[PDB]
Amino acid sequence: AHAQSKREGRHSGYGKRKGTREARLPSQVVWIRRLRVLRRLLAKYRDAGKIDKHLYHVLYKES
Amino acid sequence: AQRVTFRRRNPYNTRSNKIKVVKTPGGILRAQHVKKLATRPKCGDCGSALQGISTLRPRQYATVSKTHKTVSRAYGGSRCANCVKERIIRAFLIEEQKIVKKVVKEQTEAAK
Amino acid sequence: AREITDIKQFLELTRRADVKTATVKINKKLNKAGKPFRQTKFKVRGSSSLYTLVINDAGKAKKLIQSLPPTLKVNRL
Amino acid sequence: AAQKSFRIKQKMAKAKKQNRPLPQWIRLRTNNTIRYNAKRRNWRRTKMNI
Amino acid sequence: GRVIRNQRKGAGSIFTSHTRLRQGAAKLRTLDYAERHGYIRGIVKQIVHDSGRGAPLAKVVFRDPYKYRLREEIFIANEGVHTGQFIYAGKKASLNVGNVLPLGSVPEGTIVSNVEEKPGDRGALARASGNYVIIIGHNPDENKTRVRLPSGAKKVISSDARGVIGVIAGGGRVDKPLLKAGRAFHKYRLKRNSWPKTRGVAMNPVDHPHGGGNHQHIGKASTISRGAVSGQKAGLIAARRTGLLRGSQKTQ
RNA sequence: GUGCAGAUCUUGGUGGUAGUAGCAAAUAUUCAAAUGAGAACUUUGAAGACUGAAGUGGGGAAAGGUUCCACGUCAACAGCAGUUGGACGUGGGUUAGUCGAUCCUAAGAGAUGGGGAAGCUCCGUUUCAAAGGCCUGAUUUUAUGCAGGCCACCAUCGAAAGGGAAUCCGGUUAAGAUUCCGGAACCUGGAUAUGGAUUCUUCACGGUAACGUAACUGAAUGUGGAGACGUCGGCGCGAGCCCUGGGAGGAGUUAUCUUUUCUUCUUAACAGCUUAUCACCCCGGAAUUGGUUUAUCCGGAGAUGGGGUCUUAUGGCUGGAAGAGGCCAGCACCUUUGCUGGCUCCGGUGCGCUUGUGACGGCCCGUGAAAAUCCACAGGAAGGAAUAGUUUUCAUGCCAGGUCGUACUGAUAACCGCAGCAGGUCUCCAAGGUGAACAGCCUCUAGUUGAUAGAAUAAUGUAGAUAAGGGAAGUCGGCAAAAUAGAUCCGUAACUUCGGGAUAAGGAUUGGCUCUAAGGGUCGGGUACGAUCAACUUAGAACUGGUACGGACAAGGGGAAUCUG
């Protein structure tokens, strides 16, 4: 029951928090997820040819 | 929640005491001891793991057939191909220049 | 320790030397999706190894069963 | 201990044997003097020093 | 009183060298037929870190002239030698960094390391990281050679005495601060048990000439004579001068 | 060896003290039955609690030595008791080719030719020494002399946590089990015969190559490899655990409510096929530089791309193997105890937890053992076929595997502390919630419920709390105590070696409930989007309450200076 309300975004207020924002969800974890998703899009846009390898390479390093 | 015990007198976490957990047909959890992992044999020239060769702990190499211990080229279970490639070319060219070296100083003696 | 799919190779084993006993196991199993069928495993006890041939076809089974050497000791189920 | 030398296991055995009460028929012998076993030993009172 | 600290070291109990990881003694090849008449060729098969040493060893393999087999030597590596390089050792041998030649066979100004004291001893002088000796002259009659060692001293030895061209590798090690107790700790951990050092002046009299007093202090001149006896020698032994050295060093 | 009142005299015995100090740490007990002369204390049933997987759980190492188990049993012992016991009496109990020792080497120890020393002995360990033994040939008096060629390695002891040939699952005892029983394997040594392979081109073919294989002769000598190795970091993957959907069973609750809460649904070594990051090969020849990791490293010394090769950690399917084990129903009956059935199925998820492992990266004046042992290659000594030879590194088959330890405790009672002492004493396995968490607090499994008891609640205490107004006036001294504290946001001085000082200081906010928004995966697209499934994070907004909300637990007082390292 409780686990459900947490899925509903409950008991999450500032008074319910003891560990730091980092300890709860590390920044690096967040970043690694993101940079991999970006990395993963570029690759399929190139493979499909939606983007050309030159534009890809630029976006790669900008990502 | 089901916990487990070593199967031998040795209480400590030494590398010979490595353990694994396993579900049995009895339906229960039990430890089973685990031999140390074997490592790949290495080229003597360079030191890469030489391909084609099976990897076992040293005395198990006696329990296996010779095809697992070699590859079909010369220096098979010993050197790494590309290394053998080199000592062919090197041998040849040196044995050649060795002729070039003699006849040149054969003339040098004769004209001087 | 070993399994056999060659019905010819099998018979050869049964007539070899060291092989005295043997056993035939019968299993109810299901086919594909819907229905059942009758599986039979022929287990031959060799000196260092137990060979077992699985005949999925009920017909080949009955045929194979009689093919067994008459001097061989066989355990039913 | 708990994995022993045979030597120790042997002494341990002789020790076990010596641990019994005085056989009572001795008490009946002519000129008997021994009343009780005076060398009796117990594992929680005296340790046997190997 | 007690036997002081510098007396207890000679009995070699806890003071022996910590030797377990060492590659084995560094030496020149035995001085044999090949080396004193011709030259002989080798390959450096490796250059490697020795424990408790400043400078890397070089494993150098040669052929055994009298038997079919390989024979491997341990050299102190001169700066610039490299794996796969060919090493030449003998009376007649070209003058190149890494080779080993008799001191007689090299011109003045030549720079060599691991040089023998007597010929054959497989090297004595100038083995520490950064060090070398310079050949400052020859006396062909009685075939001696005059060299200058790292200390500044100038010694004269047999021209047959072998040395190896170049300087020893890993130099400049001592320019970097140790920065903390631990770095020193791990340093002497692989040498011997000399660290840390209690000052005698922090001890009681039983322990040391310097021991005792209601203030820390030596109490008599800390310059001790050679004539002094064991248990007496601590502080500055046989000092011909003492005090901050002013002005240029560097013997004339 | 002759006379005691003394010597803090010697040994032994005995008093007053005194039925006195006391038997108060470790939360905690209770009802009934049974047994028995006897029950606060034994056994059983019930109830109340506890340890809370960093255990009061399940095992071991040292050490102990029978304490293990059964039966009998209370004189002493367990600072109350006793019918109970680690006590007393009497018996029973420890099963191995595979688990250890055994073998190897580590620091080290220590014989020997010797050299010291009056000598007990000291030094040396390959050291100034004539230091030893293998492979087969020579024998057809015959049994093992000599003929070669090697090897000059020169004792030995030293690890029940280092190195190391080989075993698993189920069942079983009062007490033993990787040791017994059942089944199924594997290693080593010794013997060997049949099958297959090989050969008239004698000592195998195939692939451009990486390399493939059921095999595919190989002495001396030599060389390579394995054994064989630091630490920390993030990232990838495996296993077990954790969470969870459908179904098939059994159990609990049901005044009311819950298609509900709890639980069973398992698969060993070993074998076959198959499975890999890395590495490598072939084709190709690159600026408009490309590829690419979370982490910037790679390419004309050949990148990107396309195609292949290899290790088999590891996983998958099958054999082992459902016949086992788990969970149910339906009959039988003083028994030994059966009998008959059914079902044991298909999925999901991840910055989860523990552990294993890979490819990388950080560090060093630290760069993180040895030997036994096993294999390989270079070499080509030699031995070998057509009327039949070579092969036991391919398959199958035969025999054997000794000696010693193996019980149990491992600690608030089996060890050491004079003891059933609040001390000490090496280590493996580790569930759910809350939460950053192996924290505290509550729980499941398992184990406990042991520590004299009854009645009262004076003084004085020990240990735990609170106090109006004042606020260090107390004291040598703020000693003791109190105050503070998590997290998000705001804000932060002198000075400084520029790294700090800093959580400086100083502030606001925090429940419940109900919504909104942002953040991802996967598949088909000719040479813009659609469809589906699975996750708590962060911010914003309403409503609501005796203004409460890190509601217990958990959790820094701060500032200005002097002396000093």
Ligand SMILES: [Mg+2]
């Ligand atoms: Mg970061």
Ligand SMILES: [Mg+2]
């Ligand atoms: Mg992705």
Ligand SMILES: [Mg+2]
């Ligand atoms: Mg880039």
Ligand SMILES: [Mg+2]
């Ligand atoms: Mg055990």
Ligand SMILES: [Mg+2]
């Ligand atoms: Mg470790």
Ligand SMILES: [Mg+2]
């Ligand atoms: Mg292979």
Ligand SMILES: [Mg+2]
């Ligand atoms: Mg191969």
Ligand SMILES: [Mg+2]
């Ligand atoms: Mg060949």
Ligand SMILES: [Mg+2]
């Ligand atoms: Mg005692």
Ligand SMILES: [Mg+2]
């Ligand atoms: Mg004694």
Ligand SMILES: [Mg+2]
């Ligand atoms: Mg030494």
Ligand SMILES: [Mg+2]
């Ligand atoms: Mg020290």
Ligand SMILES: [Mg+2]
């Ligand atoms: Mg000093």
Ligand SMILES: [Mg+2]
């Ligand atoms: Mg000092």
Ligand SMILES: [Mg+2]
């Ligand atoms: Mg002092």
Ligand SMILES: [Mg+2]
């Ligand atoms: Mg003195």
